[PDB]
Amino acid sequence: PTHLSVDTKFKTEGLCVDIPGIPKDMTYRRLISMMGFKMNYQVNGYPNMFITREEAIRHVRAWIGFDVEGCHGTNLPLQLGFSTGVNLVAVPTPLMYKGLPWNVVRIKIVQMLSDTLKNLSDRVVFVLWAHGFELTSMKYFVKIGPERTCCLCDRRATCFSTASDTYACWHHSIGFDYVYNPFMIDVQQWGFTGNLQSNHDLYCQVHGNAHVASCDAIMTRCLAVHECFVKRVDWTIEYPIIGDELKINAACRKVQHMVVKAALLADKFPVLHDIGNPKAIKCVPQADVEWKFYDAQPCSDKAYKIEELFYSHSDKFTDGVCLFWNCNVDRYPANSIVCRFDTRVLSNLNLPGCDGGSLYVNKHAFHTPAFDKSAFVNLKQLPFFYYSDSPCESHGIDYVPLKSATCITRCNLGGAVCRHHANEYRLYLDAYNMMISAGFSLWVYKQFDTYNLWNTFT
Ligand SMILES: C[n+]1cn([C@@H]2O[C@H](COP(=O)(O)OP(=O)(O)OP(=O)(O)OC[C@H]3O[C@@H](n4cnc5c(=O)[nH]c(N)nc54)[C@H](O)[C@@H]3O)[C@@H](O)[C@H]2O)c2nc(N)[nH]c(=O)c21
Numbered sequence: 001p002t003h004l005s006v007d008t009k010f011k012t013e014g015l016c017v018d019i020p021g022i023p024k025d026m027t028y029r030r031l032i033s034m035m036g037f038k039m040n041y042q043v044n045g046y047p048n049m050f051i052t053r054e055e056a057i058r059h060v061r062a063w064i065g066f067d068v069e070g071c072h073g074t075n076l077p078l079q080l081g082f083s084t085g086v087n088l089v090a091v092p093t094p095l096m097y098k099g100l101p102w103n104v105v106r107i108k109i110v111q112m113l114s115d116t117l118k119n120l121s122d123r124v125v126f127v128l129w130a131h132g133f134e135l136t137s138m139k140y141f142v143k144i145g146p147e148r149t150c151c152l153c154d155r156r157a158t159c160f161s162t163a164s165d166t167y168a169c170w171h172h173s174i175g176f177d178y179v180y181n182p183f184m185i186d187v188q189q190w191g192f193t194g195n196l197q198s199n200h201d202l203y204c205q206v207h208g209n210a211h212v213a214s215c216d217a218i219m220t221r222c223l224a225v226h227e228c229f230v231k232r233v234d235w236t237i238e239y240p241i242i243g244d245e246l247k248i249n250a251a252c253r254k255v256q257h258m259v260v261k262a263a264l265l266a267d268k269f270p271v272l273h274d275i276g277n278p279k280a281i282k283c284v285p286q287a288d289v290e291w292k293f294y295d296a297q298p299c300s301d302k303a304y305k306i307e308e309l310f311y312s313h314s315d316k317f318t319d320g321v322c323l324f325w326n327c328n329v330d331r332y333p334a335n336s337i338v339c340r341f342d343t344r345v346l347s348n349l350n351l352p353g354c355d356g357g358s359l360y361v362n363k364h365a366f367h368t369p370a371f372d373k374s375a376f377v378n379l380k381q382l383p384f385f386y387y388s389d390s391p392c393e394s395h396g397i398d399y400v401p402l403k404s405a406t407c408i409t410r411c412n413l414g415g416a417v418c419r420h421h422a423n424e425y426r427l428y429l430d431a432y433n434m435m436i437s438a439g440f441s442l443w444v445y446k447q448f449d450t451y452n453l454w455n456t457f458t
């Protein structure tokens, strides 16, 4: 039950306009052969060009929307659209390219897919709203066969070159002309009513329809992300490490302990309303504050309404401070400590999402509602600072003397930062800059002032 059986039925009603007379009874085995490919009875790791809904979710980083529109069927040009926004015109002789024969179009496709996916996934999953021409055009730039490894490394092969008769992954595909062993999935097979635009526009207002192939490719992938990461959520699926996931997660927990501990020392809140992950633990377990938890799973569609979270416990969320660490609400109260992911940040962990949101894949997949500046009108941006009440003692690196107005320590209060707190300062600054560059923003109540922390050294 792992892979999609090649004898599974395939609904061809969406194909009968480009391909009139197509059989109603159709399997993937008869469809792959129809597309011009031969499986030759194979058990070499490539059982089907099409993958399941579950298998596609585990390879979401490889999703590339793909659509082909008749520009004017072997006798007419074809407009190739990809969710990267690229439009290629192939002739049988937001960016748009002029018409060119297939032998040079396939070279651009290998280059475009490789630069997109080399730091993301080991494969490519062509997300389709299939109507005919996109399946029949793959024979001009897709070659299938047994699973192979790269000729320059041990990654699996994703490209093939007719010049050298060799194979390569996304990293070493310069000069290659064919996509080797790709995967694909037809969203239209999931049982929708209506066309692509009517179904996409039910949940997203950001992607329009300029009647170009790439617009449909973007809407197709967007509709797929909504069905797999907005309407349905699966937090049990783990995703491989492809970047600084571990340092970013560790930096977020390092900053959270620093910020919440300092806010409790500076303002002496009697109560703390920790609103967010239902499995959360005290990030400052040594604090005197009364810690009250409120369960709320990460929202994947729209940001929570602060009215429905609070108003319907201590119930007096105006007492003490409220902690919204990656708990996206529409408008945070004035007595809040907030960590909110910026969906606009470009990174290999953050994928384009639905209706302004993004899909942040770090160990797990979190579809995050679109970043809204108006949510922080009652708060201010949290400035960088480093606080430490630990003993100014170095145990165990080369020391350039540290001078910083944001090093809240006894040694800095005394006019000279010690080597221990200087190491921890520069380590915390690296973690802070790691967290901010990853896309997380920090916000705090306007009364927060690091000048109140100097007095805890008395
Ligand atoms: C809720 N949320 C978080 N972020 C961010 O996304 C990343 C995923 O981290 P994560 O939540 O997968 O794990 P940690 O917090 O490191 O786990 P931890 O504190 O360790 O809690 C225990 C869990 O982690 C596991 N775990 C515990 N210790 C470790 C460890 O040392 N290493 C690893 N790899 N896992 C550990 C443990 O088995 C359990 O699954 C982080 O940057 C989050 O801030 C969000 N970002 C967006 N856009 N939207 C969200 O809704 C959102």
Ligand SMILES: [Zn+2]
Pocket: 150, 151, 152, 153, 154, 155, 168, 169, 170, 171, 172
């Ligand atoms: Zn390679």
Ligand SMILES: [Zn+2]
Pocket: 200, 204, 205, 206, 207, 218, 219, 222, 223, 354, 355
């Ligand atoms: Zn959309």
Ligand SMILES: [Zn+2]
Pocket: 391, 392, 393, 409, 410, 411, 412, 417, 418, 419, 420, 421, 422
């Ligand atoms: Zn010190």
